[PDB]
Structures are given as structure tokens and as C-alpha cells.
Amino acid sequence: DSELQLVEQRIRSFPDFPTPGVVFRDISPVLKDPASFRAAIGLLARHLKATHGGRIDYIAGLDSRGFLFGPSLAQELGLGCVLIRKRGKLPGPTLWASYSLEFGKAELEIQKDALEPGQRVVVVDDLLATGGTMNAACELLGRLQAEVLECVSLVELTSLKGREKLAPVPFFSLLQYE
Amino acid sequence: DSELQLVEQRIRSFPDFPTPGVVFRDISPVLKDPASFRAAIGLLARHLKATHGGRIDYIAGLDSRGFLFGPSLAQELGLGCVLIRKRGKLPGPTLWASYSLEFGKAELEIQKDALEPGQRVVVVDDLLATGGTMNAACELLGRLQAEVLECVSLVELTSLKGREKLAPVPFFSLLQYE
Ligand SMILES: Nc1ncnc2c1ncn2[C@@H]1O[C@H](COP(=O)(O)O)[C@@H](O)[C@H]1O
Ligand SMILES: Nc1ncnc2c1ncn2[C@@H]1O[C@H](COP(=O)(O)O)[C@@H](O)[C@H]1O
């Protein structure tokens, strides 16, 4: 698939960033090459329409690199985008959820009025690793009584088993690395 | 302008967040309403094409809320988007710049290969307040020997004199509040 190739050739890997042991996958070149960015959005949108038909109400983009894909994906689908943020950034009543990151803990947050009960959402981030971030996003959406139809990313790190962590919520990635 | 009205009517204002006396301008409803988001991007793109013609090489989006608008704006103009991030987030060789934020300092950072000398860029963020954030972005881009043609935002808080801070770099906002 030549479209998928346009995305894969624009991921660059950095060993031992930001700390020894981690291989950082940088999506920055995807954003800088408009053909690559369009390809990524199109592949995601095609997968989602093929899997869900007209059942998706909103895209939810995750702070911060998910913000890079969420609005464009939503627009391609004719949908709105809701935001899930790092704690402390959103005004009005919120809910929050932790999930260890690094050697400690961190929290995502959503506005209590971001969605109505029963609304169906697809969550997008750039990369799925342990699944902690996406899992916290699903927890928050679930607490608003929203139905998470699927989580998607450009990149999945399969040895970290984030897919199993999200089960039974379906997951889809464009590219997989160990 | 009916398009501009579509954006204006989706800015929600929260008094006393995060501190008493400040009014937080929340762009979330713009993202959530696909017609509003499309109107915002179209208004920005129309302004930039009319102002700069073919001079723009790249859009630069600012972490984090600028990430919500940068890629869509770039796609609308047929351009790539480069990223300016909170320090410590980007791999590889970088430049960073401090600036004042609230009661302390913060730092932005850009990859040294984000742009080549002579390339022309427009910076986008959701909102211009003091201008410290946009000013640091301009400094970083200048240090790569890039030319900043303009900075743009959805919202500008005119009493904080951000425009004046950025001068002589031109600036444009869709909406203005005191
Ligand atoms: N190796 C990596 N390269 C780039 N980003 C990563 C990497 N591991 C984790 N992330 C980021 O951290 C979050 C995923 O981590 P996790 O919560 O473990 O699934 C996403 O928001 C990613 O942007
Ligand atoms: N009243 C406000 N409402 C919403 N966001 C704000 C407000 N003031 C500052 N910001 C955010 O902080 C940054 C601009 O601050 P400044 O550097 O003071 O121009 C932008 O990235 C804005 O998103």
C-alpha cells in the first residue's frame, strides 16, 4: 500500500530518548510532509467508515500529539472533535483519571459536559505503548456514559501489550513495531 | 460575516479560571461543531492566502492548543506543519527559549532540522494573550534563520498588548476581546 508507505517512511526512530531503554517514534515528519499527513488521516478515516458505518458521533483527541490528528480525522468524517487533556488545563467541572507514566503518576481530564449519555466516540492518539493513556481516556468517556467504539493510533508498540490492556475496546493502528 | 459568526458563537467564556478575575476563552465548542471548525480554518486560510500569496512554506503549530489548528490549516493551504513544543518533548538536536508564563518561566523548543535557512513560516496558536508564547516561537524560528511572515490565532486579548510585543512581526486574529 503506497499510502501506508508514505506514512511509514516519515516515522523516525530515536534510541534512548528520552531516557535509556526507550526507542522514541517521532511522527514529526508525517506532519511536515502534507502528502504523508493526508495519507495518515485517509487511512484512519477509511478504516473507521468501513468498520463503523455511520455510527460514530465524535472523535476524541488526546493531549497533546493526538490533537495533531483528531480535528483533521473528525473533519474528514464530517464529525466534531472532543478533547481529553492533561489535568489542570480545562475550565468548568471536570472528571479526571490517573495511570502511571514513567516512574510515577499523571492524570487526564475531560469536561463533565463533553458528551451526553449514549454518544459514540472513537479515541485517537499518535502512538499506543502500554495503553495507560488510552485506557484512562476510555475510563473518562465511560464515566460520561459514552460508548467507546474504538481506539486508533498511527503507531503501536506490540511488545507492550496495550491492545490487550484496552480489550474489550477494539484497537487499530496503521503501523506496528516491537 | 456568517462564517465568523459561526466561530464567535462557539467560544465559551469562563470567569475566574484559573485565577480570580481572569476570563478563560474556551475554544472547545469550535472543535466540537464541525461547521464551526471548518469556518475557523477557512477564515484563517483565506486571510493567509490573500496576505502572503505563495510566500508561505510551512505552518508552525504551537504546543498544545495550536496543534488543534495547525495541521488542518496547513492541509487547507497545501503545506506541511512543523511543531514547536514545550521543552523536553522533542528528540534529536534542538534549540530552546525561555519565556515568562504566569508566575514563573517555561521553555519552548524546536528541532534544528524543522526548517532550513530562508524558509518562510506562519505561526498559529489558539489564543494570543501577553504574547510571550508566540514571541518565544518567533525567536526559535529566527534562530533557524527562518523568516516568520505572520503569527495568527483564533482569539486575541487586546488589553494585554500581545500584538505590540510581536511587532514588527505581523499578527492577525479572528476574534478580539478586551
Ligand atoms: N516510544 C514512544 N515514542 C513516542 N511516543 C511515545 C512512546 N511511548 C509512549 N509515547 C507517548 O505516550 C503515550 C502512550 O503511552 P502509553 O500510555 O504507555 O500507551 C502517547 O500519548 C504517546 O504519544
Ligand atoms: N484567557 C485565556 N483563555 C484561554 N487560554 C489562554 C488565556 N490566556 C492565555 N492562554 C493560553 O496561553 C498561551 C498564550 O499566553 P501568552 O503567552 O500570554 O500569549 C496560549 O497558548 C493560550 O492558549
Ligand SMILES: [Mg+2]
Ligand atoms: Mg502523547
